[PDB]
Amino acid sequence: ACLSRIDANLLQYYEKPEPNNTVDLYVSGSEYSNCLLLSNSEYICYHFSSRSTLLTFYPLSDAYHGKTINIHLPNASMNQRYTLTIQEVEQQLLVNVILKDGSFLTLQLPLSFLFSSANTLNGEWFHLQNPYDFTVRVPHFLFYVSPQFSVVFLEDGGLLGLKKVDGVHYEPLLFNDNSYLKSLTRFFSRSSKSDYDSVISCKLFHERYLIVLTQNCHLKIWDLTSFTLIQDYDMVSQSDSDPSHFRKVEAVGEYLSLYNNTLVTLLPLENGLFQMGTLLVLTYTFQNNIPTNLSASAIWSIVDLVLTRPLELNVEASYLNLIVLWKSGTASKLQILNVNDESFKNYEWIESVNKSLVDLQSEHDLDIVTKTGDVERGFCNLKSRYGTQIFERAQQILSENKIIMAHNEDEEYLANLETILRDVKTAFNEASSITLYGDEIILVNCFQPYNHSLYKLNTTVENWFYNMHSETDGSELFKYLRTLNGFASTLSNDVLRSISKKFLDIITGELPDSMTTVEKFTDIFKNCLENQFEITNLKILFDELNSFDIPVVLNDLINNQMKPGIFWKKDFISAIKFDGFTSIISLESLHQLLSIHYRITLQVLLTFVLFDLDTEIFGQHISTLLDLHYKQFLLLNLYRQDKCLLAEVLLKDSSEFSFGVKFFNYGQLIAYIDSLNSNVYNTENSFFMTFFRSSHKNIRFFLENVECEVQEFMFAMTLFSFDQSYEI
């Protein structure tokens, strides 16, 4: 797994789970969603509702303050988003939609209107029209070709053309079709409900050639100059012709995408065949069938695929990259097929983590930082974790099902909250489509508006974290960390927390500076670790540890991997305006990195308390580690305590980048996150405490922890807000 999942709820920082500026247009979104890049370098998001009666638009980089527009439709489209198109013509979002009754609706939405404050819209922003009789021959797929021309596909197998004469009116330009004549055979009828070989995917090549994929997996190719069938390939008669079962595709989906003159096609054989040839002159020429690596019966459905230029992956042997998004229920799967060379015979499948760190930690009870105790403490915890949109949707579902909080301390209620919150989140995060943010940034758009998932290329350390129970090889450092995790994973959460606390205590002086390091480690050991682990695992850890050259590995870990670089500014494109998207993506990514760092650092420190490692030789490392552990803890605490505030102080930390950043590739993003890491390990805490004072229970531990004169003051006032206050 070379990529990780970073989840983004664009409204997370704000209390209102809805933008104040929402406008409802009417014509006389949890079923499809996508992003589209516009002339102004902005991404517009759109959602088509379950019923296909509501279309919603909102600006990716300004969801809360920007305008979201709901366009209400008189009836549903004939066949969902598949009978809908959206393209930017000239400073306008042109949207066409064949409705159920047969009408062909046109929408014209000025770009300005999409980024204005206005709640009104002038002029003819919509046109109804009946160019063809769709009662008899029902369409199911609408494909945009040009501002004036676009084709319609029909359920029975026929194509209709649609040519724009003036600015509004459309007329049918019919294609010659003699396929139907297979009705003459005893094996097909015109009247039969089966037998249809309708189009399920379609792409435009060089403005002129129209490549269509049919339900029987025929690749037909139409020349729009001639309006004539030029090619007809049977994709299946190439590979092992299975007489048992080839699943004729029973719905429109994303079964092909082309880059330059290459073309991948998705064929169903255990839902596992990526054919890919080349287009050239028109001739399609096969190269290879690349199967999938999917098990659990192979029960994943394609959501979206995107063939494109190669990424910066851990195998330099690369020529092209296919990004692939599967789904199974609300569970998703992101993979990248890397093809090495111009022969499509050498390739490699690259998997990714399909759950975010926060989620994995919550599931596997690996979260050490989140404060325990009170029921209302848990309330703040979940509220802060999930965001208001989810938390309130969950409280809605609770009261609907007649689950009502008995009293202040109803733990039985909170229990229910955990799950409903998780489920709501999971639902909201159901995958719908892929967007290539920037040049190469893999973005997934979810069913619930304001919910996106970015898939981020992992750094070295992140790859180690995410592949402990996998990596066959690995460097010495990986193996060392792996063995440390091998021991530490046997300890329980309470023990680990008490140890973390003690490491804070060394810094706060609660473990007096008067003590030697050895004495503090002995204290820690006796109070926290003694009788709390199996001696067999200790022996194991010691043995494995003796194979390593510890000073070197620790050197590489501390001074290269974990301690970031001095920058002479390496272009983190300065944002002119606040970008809520990159803001939350940055904060979540930072949180993942520092969480991983935290777990490593703690495991190493643990090894320093357990064994007789010369406290003088490693003194430098020990104190650096305790400093880093301390800073990590602090940051993570502030993160789950008040994300908005943290973001605000962490971006008002960098002067030249006060408004935020833009990143168009993975390198710029990684470098920016690293930059923030640097900020943390080296003004934030002050701006945060200040803005906060102008999260009460918080800064008690965080004036016991994050305090260690000013600290006394803060403790004295937060405790006034009484004997302790006056005394201090």
């Epitope: 596997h364 091998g486 194991i540």
Partner: antibody, heavy 112, light 103 residues
């Protein structure tokens, strides 16, 4: 793919038995081997596991100090050495790996 | 030690009936919960892992879900080959739900 379990049977109480579980058709060296037992007419009881990958072992309270789990990666074989056996230890023991792959199980009678 | 309760301890149902088996954790285990089916005289077969993931090859009539500390195994349409003892698991196991084909 198949686990194999040999070495149970009848054993006098206070006595000893070594169970073997010979594995194949998966990566033994990165798997975890568990031993799970079922007393006549009762439910499943997890007693022990070992990480091939790091040797890490652990035990249910009911068997700690009497049972030793071990593993030889070079013959893809794991072991459970059972000492000071008790009537409470009769049952059928399985061997599972992580639990996707299960031993056909071998029955251990402690009595006389 | 964690205690996994199951309810009911023994149920009975028609072929084609929808069957619900519940499991309650003594403490609060996270979604680290698996469901197994055991025929008598044979090794348990994994059905569900991570509370709601369907294990490879298992019929889709079996599903798992969670509500707080309550875990649910559902058989959407009971078949005559489905009589068995079903177990939840977090390591500790449930006491075991025994189903048969009600008459």
């Amino acid at each position: 793919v198949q686990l194999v379990e040999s070495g149970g049977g009848l054993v006098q109480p206070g006595g000893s038995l070594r169970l073997s579980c010979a594995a194949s058709g998966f990566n033994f060296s990165s798997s975890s081997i568990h031993w799970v037992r079922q007393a006549p007419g009762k439910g499943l009881e997890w007693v022990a596991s070992i990480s091939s990958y790091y040797g890490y072992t652990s035990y249910a309270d009911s068997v700690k100090g009497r049972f030793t789990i071990s593993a030889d990666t070079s013959k893809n074989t794991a072991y459970l050495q059972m000492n000071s056996l008790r009537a409470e230890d009769t049952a059928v023991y399985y061997c599972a790996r992580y639990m996707d792959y299960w031993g056909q199980g071998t029955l251990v009678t402690v009595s006389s | 030690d964690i205690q996994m309760t199951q309810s009911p301890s023994s149920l009975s149902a028609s072929v084609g009936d929808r069957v619900t088996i519940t499991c309650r954790a003594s403490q609060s285990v996270s979604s680290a919960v698996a469901w197994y089916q055991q025929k008598p005289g044979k090794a348990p077969k994994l059905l569900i892992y991570s509370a709601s993931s369907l294990y490879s090859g298992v019929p889709s009539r079996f599903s798992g879900s969670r509500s707080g500390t309550d875990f649910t195994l559902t058989i959407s349409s009971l078949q005559p080959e489905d009589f068995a003892t079903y177990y939840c698991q977090q390591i500790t196991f449930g006491q075991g739900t025994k189903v048969e084909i009600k008459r």
